[PDB]
Design a protein around this ligand. Structure first.
Ligand SMILES: [Zn+2]
Ligand SMILES: [Zn+2]
Ligand SMILES: [Zn+2]
Ligand SMILES: [Zn+2]
Lengths: 71, 83
DNA sequence: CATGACCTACTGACCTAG
DNA sequence: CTAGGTCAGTAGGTCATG
């Protein structure tokens, strides 16, 4: 009904300040527990949709942080 | 327990959207990384466990024909609505 | 060289404590 | 209602072998 702000999949609620799906919510929580560092093999700006969200963890985390997800 | 849709070997899960063995899974990924594959026959070779490496064109051909694609990837367990 | 068995490093549907 | 935890799940790296 309401799409995830990060990837556009079916959202499940407001998680860490942003309407996200369960995948982006779990992905972001795991990134903030270890203080992750990802690197983009491409142009530092890869489209984050439902099927591409796992192809760059750097740009997925970047989308989460830019739209205000915080713990 | 489910035979590989490409070659009939024991599959190890759903890879790029298709139930495949470890061999066809790694073969498809390498084919997309790169790519040239030519068939010395009529582009119709049977793909089974013993013959899967004899013609790479017909192996990748079968991979794509069954829908193997980086867009068909799905992680996690399967949903209640899929049982 | 390419192949594929094996292992790592994750992914996300589902549930409960709060 | 939503963190957080669980565990059934997979991409992809390795490298001895084909
Ligand atoms: Zn999402
Ligand atoms: Zn990227
Ligand atoms: Zn196979
Ligand atoms: Zn052939």
């Amino acid at each position: 009904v309401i799409p995830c702000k990060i990837c556009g999949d079916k959202s499940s609620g407001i998680h860490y300040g942003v309407i996200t799906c369960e995948g982006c919510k779990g992905f972001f929580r795991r990134s903030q527990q270890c203080n992750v560092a990802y690197s983009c093999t491409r142009q530092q700006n890869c489209p984050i949709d439902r099927t591409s969200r796992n192809r760059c963890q750097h740009c997925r985390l970047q989308k989460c942080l830019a739209l205000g997800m915080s713990r």
